[PDB]
Structures are given as structure tokens and as C-alpha cells.
RNA sequence: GGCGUAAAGCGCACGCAGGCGGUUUGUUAAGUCAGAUGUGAAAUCCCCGGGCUCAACCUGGGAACUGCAUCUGAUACUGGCAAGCUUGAGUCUCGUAGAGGGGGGUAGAAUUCCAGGUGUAGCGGUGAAAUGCGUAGAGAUCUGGAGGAAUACCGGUGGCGAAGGCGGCCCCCUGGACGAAGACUGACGCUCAGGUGCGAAAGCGUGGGGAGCAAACAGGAUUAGAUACCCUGGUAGUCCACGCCGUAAACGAUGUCGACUUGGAGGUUGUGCCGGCGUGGCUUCCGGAGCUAACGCGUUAAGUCGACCGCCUGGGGA
């Protein structure tokens, strides 16, 4: 999991206050950070199916939140997926 | 997930009457209030009130005649998976008129007799007997 | 009778929490040390209007059957029926007293013949062993049926202690439409009782209070 | 209409399309509703009359065609649009327990084997035997060494996991659950054909490893026979890495999600106020109503409901 400092950093970066932790951008960004971090774990631990199910849950949840943001506000969506380096 | 709050309200009424509960409570909605006004005005329930501003809670006071429940049978008819609309000429008769069907018309939620008198059709919400 | 004498003799004290009947919740006041308390404030009026119904019953010469069969309450119910001109049962309620009246009536006649023979010298000309068998049959027929021997037909009312201990008489009455007035504890099922009465149905003091209430009020009804 | 046991819940899931959608207002008027207009050929069905000597038959008159289109209107509900809201769903903080997973390491007990000290005639097996083993010194017992596999006690109708499954100890990487305080987002939800993934054991391929166990096989017994059950050996396999297979009575023979409906006695982990009373999550056993063909299930439903999916339609052939 992400440490407290990493969470605080991303939350300040993508939320529009120090206390905004529920907005779509923060959720998508936290999921993206954990996914990217775990890429190295699953390059070494290919048979770790049980943890990969949680990784896939993060991917599915980020997909859902990104599509929600897209149908709610396109501008914030493109800004997020350019900032986060996501294809779509 | 909850996808038919009207069904939940009919179920709460049915189950409360089967458990001899004096009154039932539930999250409120305007449409539930219209249904309950039809229920109370036709003598199926005793009273209802709404409490709360941001989260209204709707309480229905149930009634029993000789100890036994007044609501003999209540059923959802039109449901989210199968919506049911009838013209004014095809409004159903529940227990040959002893019961009622709650009909939502362009003039509001009313009974089958009232809908027939107003000369309107609409969605058939529930049978109550 | 009233809240004071009930709370003093031990009416209010109920059975343990793990034995209550969820149909007894409304008459429950509260709990203490995992034993229940019966709300006397409801006990008094329902009981007194049951006493009023019974007082009215005896005025129409309606025969009452006293039903209590606990070992320590046999003499209490028998005295209450003895001092009341009534019929009673204080040993095991035979299956068939009420719904099978046609056959129990024959054993009542048999007890009548043995009771004539008992005070008659009939058990002298017999060979001292058939007569002994007659005496033992008399003993058991008194133990069981010696409270309804003169009844002569079905009764009109029932008064019960521990409705579940005597649920067979309750069910027999409900089969025959005899209204029942039963002392219903927290651990009792009242769905078969028309006039129910909460109260400790085991404590001898409370039990003899209910018994004296019904006996005296039936005395009052027959006074009229 | 069904799917615990009669046929029937996919082994388990993620999830596109599809289906369905918490609550407030406005707006639309598509679905829905109302009215009208055009059309829906005649004949036929239906009714009330007539003449065939009556009926068949014919035929006068009268109703239906339950649809489609357009126009005019209503706006409760469903849909679209807009703004919201927080109760659903999710994020954060702190903490809690855990055989959840992947990797590495290590410890003790035991079996087997190798070398050795003591020592002699048995051991081993079984219903009884024999095969086997032992004077070329076994079995027993003591020491040293090698190796593989599994982790006694704890241990628990205990725990964790989507299911399959997961049990010594330590470390590294890692997933989820639950609890209590608030905040934050503001319907972001549920289900899911096709798709994709995971999936016991056995089995397959390549390379290793191999103590014990053990399909096959060999012998000895048993038996009428004994391709068995029992005994003595024993090879694949069981173990490891990677790939494949994709099936089990993969079972609760019970699909997932949400809501509601009397009670009693157990377990486990949180947390509240002073061993005592509160409030949470999962879990055992009984049982009420209800349901059920019955057996039984029974707030962890097989009860009362809603959303979606999967499946069944006599036995055999199959």
C-alpha cells in the first residue's frame, strides 16, 4: 500500500484543498500511483494471482472513476489523463 | 441495490401487517406520499407523517380490524423490469371492486375508480385488496 | 385485588429471560438479574375483568372447571373448589377429558360404582384380593377423576395455571369452544386464551391469590 | 411453471454490450394518458327482421376491425436535459485480527540410507501363514554423517481467501476484510450474453529432485477361481522451476445484489460507558410465523419483495 506521506502528497496535488480526499481526481491519482508502484512487484512475482486480483480491482475502479469524470466534465478528464499519463 | 422503492414500501406494509406491527417507517419520497394518501383515504392504513428535512422518514400507521390485518393482499404490478400502462377502458378490477388498483395518471396518483371517473388511464402501480 | 397484594405475595416475579414467550413482550415491565418482571399495571385490570366475566358466568349457573395440576398446588386448587361448589382437576389432565367426554364418562360411572361399593361392605364377600384391586382402582379414580365426578356434561369455562403445563385442556376447550381464563406467565403461550392473566403461576402465594380471587368472585356470582 | 434432495444455479469471478436505477426542483413531451381527424375494402364473427313448406341456405338493417399515421392537449410515472442533495457507492485519517498471496531463509521431531561401537538368533508379517529380511551377524541399542518430504502439541462446527484453497519459526514484497471518530466525492450503482482471468487431484512437456508413500508390476497368501480385498517388495507419480490441461459429490447438490419480518443458547475479532450494562463485522446449534410433496429451511431463509443472469421440460439411447 501507499505510505501516509505519498497519500498526503498526491491528495494535496490533485485535490482543491488539503482536506479533499474524495474527489474523482484524487481517487484516480491514488489508484494510478499504486498501480504504477505495483508494476515492479508483479514483474518479480508473476505467480502472485491473489494480489493481482487487488491490482485488477484498482484498474477496474480507476476505469469506472475516469469514465464517470468523463461523462461529468470533459475538461477535468483530459487534464487528469494528461497529468497522470494515461491513454484514456 | 434498491431499484424499486415502491416495491420496498409495499413489502414493508405487507411484512409489518404480517408481524402485527402497529406502524412502519421508511425513507420517504413524494410518490410514496401520493401512494400513502391513496391508501389512507381508501381506509387501508390509518395515518402517515413525514419527519426530516434533508432525510425525510415516512411512517405509516397500520390498522387491524378484529386483530387481523386490514391489508389482505398487496402486490406490485408495474415494476422497473416490466412497466404496465392501461388505457381508461382497460383499468383492472381488483377483487371485483372490493379492492383497489393504485393508478398514476396525468392528474396524479389515484385509485382505479377515480381514474375511471376522470376518464383517464395511466400506469398501474399496485393492486391492494 | 390490586397491585399491592400482587407485588407483595410474589405475582410480579417472572421466569428467566431465556424462557419468555415473545408473545408476552407487551405485558413485560422489565428485567432483573436475568429474571423477568410482569407489569402489574396491566395485570390488575385484565385479571379483574376476567373475574367480572367469571362472576357473570356463575350467575347463569355455568359450571367452572378448576385446572391446576402442579404437585404443590393440588391442595390449593382443591380447597378453592371445595369452598366454592365447583368441579376441578388437580392430577394429570387425561388426554380426552373434554373432546372424548363419551368414554371418560364411563370411567366416571365406574368411579361412582366403586364409591358406592367403598362405603357399602361390598368388599367383604369377595376374596380379599379382587376387593383390593377394587380399592386400588378407586384410589386412582379419585386421584384423577374425583373432581369432575358429579359434573354430568361438558362445562362452560376454564381457569388454568401455567397454560403450557395444561395446554391440552386449553386445546380441548378451543376444540369445543369453552372460553378459558388462564394465568399466563411470561413463559406461557396465550394464543389459545380469551381472558389472559400475567403473574407468577408457580409462587404459592401468588397462585393462592389468583385462586382466592376467582373462588370468592364465583361465590359472589352464585350469591346472586 | 419450475431449479436443496424429483430435470434444473455456470467451479469461482472481473467485466464490455444489454437490462435495471437513491432523492429535490426546474425543463422537455419521447414512452404513457385523453380527444379529434384520416385510414384500417367488401364478405366473414355478433345482434334485430325476412323467404326458401323449416333448418341448412340466402338476404335488409344494425355493431366490430382491438392497429397505423397526423394534429390538438395533460405531465403523475418512466425516459432526455440542467442544476443540486447525501441515505447508496467510493476516498482519507487511526487502529484490529488473520494458515490470504509471491520470494528467500531457518529449526526441531520422525522415517530411510551410509560408516561405526555392543551383541546374538532371530526379525518382520498375519486370522493363520508364507513371500521378504538375518550367522556374509539382521532385529534391538548408542554415536557420527547424508538426503527428501511434511510441520505433532497449539487446534477450535477457530481464522483468512472470489472459488479452488491456505497450518512450524524469521525476514522481504504484497492483496483484502472489519471496527471507531470525522471529513471528502456526490448516484460515480447493481447484474452481466459474448470476452477474459483464476481454478483440487490426477494427467501431459522440458529440466531437476526423490526420504516416505504408492497406480502399474513381481512374488506370497486367501479362494471353487481371486488379474482383488490381506502380506512382502515396488516404478511412474507424489516434491521443485516453467509451460499445458480446465475437469471433481469444484457441494450449502442452495447464482449475485438490495430491502423487510417474532425468539433462545454458543464462538471469534473490533469499539463504547462503569467482572457490569451498549454498539459493530463474520460464525455454531435450536426453533416461531411463514414456506415446503415431505424431509426440512427458518433474520446467515428454502419466509416477504425488487434487479439481472445461468439453467430445466418423461426414462433409456446420451
UniProtKB/Swiss-Prot annotation, chain C:
GO terms for biological process: translation. One of its GO terms (molecular function) is structural constituent of ribosome. One of its GO terms (cellular component) is cytosolic small ribosomal subunit. The keyword Nuclease does not apply. It comes from the Bacteria. Keywords: Ribonucleoprotein, Ribosomal protein. Signal peptide: none annotated. Belongs to the universal ribosomal protein uS2 family. This is Small ribosomal subunit protein uS2. The gene is rpsB.
Amino acid at each position: 500500500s501507499l505510505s501516509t506521506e505519498a497519500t498526503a502528497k498526491i491528495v494535496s496535488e490533485f485535490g482543491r484543498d488539503a482536506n479533499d480526499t474524495g474527489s474523482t481526481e484524487v481517487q484516480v491519482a491514488l489508484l494510478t500511483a499504486q498501480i504504477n508502484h505495483l508494476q515492479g512487484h508483479f514483474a518479480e512475482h508473476k505467480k502472485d494471482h491473489h494480489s493481482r486480483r487487488g491490482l485488477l480491482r484498482m484498474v477496474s475502479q480507476r476505469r469506472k472513476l475516469l469514465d464517470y469524470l468523463k461523462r461529468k466534465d470533459v475538461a477535468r478528464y483530459t487534464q487528469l489523463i494528461e497529468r497522470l499519463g494515461l491513454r484514456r | 441495490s434498491m431499484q424499486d422503492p415502491i416495491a420496498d414500501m409495499l413489502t414493508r406494509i405487507r411484512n409489518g401487517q404480517a408481524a402485527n406491527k402497529a406502524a412502519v417507517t421508511m425513507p420517504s419520497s413524494k410518490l410514496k406520499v401520493a401512494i400513502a394518501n391513496v391508501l389512507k383515504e381508501e381506509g387501508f392504513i390509518e395515518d402517515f407523517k413525514v419527519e426530516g428535512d434533508t432525510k425525510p422518514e415516512l411512517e405509516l400507521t397500520l390498522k387491524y380490524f378484529q386483530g387481523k390485518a386490514v391489508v389482505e393482499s398487496i402486490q406490485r404490478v408495474s415494476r422497473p423490469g416490466l412497466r404496465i400502462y392501461k388505457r381508461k377502458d382497460e383499468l383492472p378490477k381488483v377483487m371485483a371492486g372490493l379492492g383497489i388498483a393504485v393508478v398514476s395518471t396525468s392528474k396524479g396518483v389515484m385509485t382505479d375508480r377515480a381514474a375511471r371517473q376522470a376518464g383517464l388511464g395511466g400506469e398501474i402501480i399496485c393492486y391492494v385488496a | 385485588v390490586s397491585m399491592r397484594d400482587m407485588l407483595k405475595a410474589g405475582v410480579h416475579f417472572g421466569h428467566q429471560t431465556r424462557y419468555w414467550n415473545p408473545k408476552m413482550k407487551p405485558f413485560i415491565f422489565g428485567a432483573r438479574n436475568k429474571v423477568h418482571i410482569i407489569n402489574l399495571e396491566k395485570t390488575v385490570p385484565m385479571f379483574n375483568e376476567a373475574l367480572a366475566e367469571l362472576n357473570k358466568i356463575a350467575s347463569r349457573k355455568g359450571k367452572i372447571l378448576f385446572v391446576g395440576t402442579k404437585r404443590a398446588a393440588s391442595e390449593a386448587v382443591k380447597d378453592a373448589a371445595l369452598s366454592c361448589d365447583q368441579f376441578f382437576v388437580n392430577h394429570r389432565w387425561l388426554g380426552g377429558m373434554l373432546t372424548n367426554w363419551k368414554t371418560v364418562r364411563q370411567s366416571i360411572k365406574r368411579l361412582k360404582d366403586l364409591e358406592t361399593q367403598s362405603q357399602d361392605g361390598t368388599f367383604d364377600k369377595l376374596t380379599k384380593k379382587e376387593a383390593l384391586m377394587r380399592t386400588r382402582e378407586l384410589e386412582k379414580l379419585e386421584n384423577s377423576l374425583g373432581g369432575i365426578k358429579d359434573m354430568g356434561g361438558l362445562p362452560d369455562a376454564l381457569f388454568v395455571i401455567d397454560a403450557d403445563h395444561e395446554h391440552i385442556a386449553i386445546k380441548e376447550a378451543n376444540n369445543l369452544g369453552i372460553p378459558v381464563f388462564a394465568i399466563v406467565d411470561t413463559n406461557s403461550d396465550p394464543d389459545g386464551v380469551d381472558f389472559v392473566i400475567p403473574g407468577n403461576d408457580d409462587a404459592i402465594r401468588a397462585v393462592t391469590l389468583y385462586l382466592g380471587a376467582v373462588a370468592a368472585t364465583v361465590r359472589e356470582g352464585r350469591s346472586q
